[PDB]
Nucleic acid binder design. Structure first.
Ligand SMILES: [Mg+2]
Length: 156
RNA sequence: AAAUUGAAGAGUUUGAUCAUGGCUCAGAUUGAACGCUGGCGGCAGGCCUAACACAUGCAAGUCGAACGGUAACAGGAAGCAG
């Protein structure tokens, strides 16, 4: 029912004639726990405002994910520029074995049993982007059946 | 019947950013040592260095059913003296 959680809040600076201008960026992630997950990156002069902006962004532009019984559909890799991510379905009771950002994104998405690792850069925004991309691309057996022109029973 | 149920990151370069890239940390372990402290038990372990030098005691004897035998001991026998 739209569970949301803020991964990282980071202070960034701009320089002007006067001096430095600080502002805050908030990376949040929302999801319905049934497949839908979406991340948002808001910027404002103060943290709460930034978070609100991020939340609105995340709530819009969500994406559907094919989940098989609260777990992944197959082992999937994902990249986004520096962040290359691996995530593998695991037996019921394994829990989310996943990094920071990754854990958040998976949890809001609704995966209950995963084995993840973040290779490459572990920059939260890029890592979240990578995970969402991987989750999105991951197809289900009904999808493969549709593509190949067979029944799901012939493929298994 | 069961005996692979298995994979987490963080700090640190920049006014800020992403990347590269090192350093550091979170875990487990030990024939450990040192500091402070210290009640009991169970089960293990205990010269990693000088294969350096070694006082002293012990760590390989046994068989008389292989053999001459009796140093003893322990006993009887024969000779005896009270
Ligand atoms: Mg030695």
């Amino acid at each position: 029912e739209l569970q949301e959680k803020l991964i990282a809040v980071n202070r960034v600076s701009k320089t002007v004639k006067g001096g430095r201008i600080f502002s805050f960026t908030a990376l949040t992630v929302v999801g319905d726990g049934n497949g839908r997950v979406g991340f948002g990156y808001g910027k404002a002069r103060e943290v709460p405002a930034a978070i609100q902006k991020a939340m609105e962004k995340a709530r819009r532009n969500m994406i559907n994910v094919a989940l098989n019984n609260g777990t992944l559909q197959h082992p999937v890799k994902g990249v986004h520029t520096g962040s290359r991510v691996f995530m593998q379905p695991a037996s019921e009771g394994t829990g989310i074995i996943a990094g920071g950002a990754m854990r958040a994104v998976l949890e809001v998405a609704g995966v209950h049993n995963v084995l993840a690792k973040a290779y490459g850069s572990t920059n939260p925004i890029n890592v979240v982007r990578a995970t969402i991309d991987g989750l999105e691309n991951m197809n289900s057996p009904a999808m493969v059946a549709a593509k190949r022109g067979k029944s799901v029973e012939e493929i298994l």
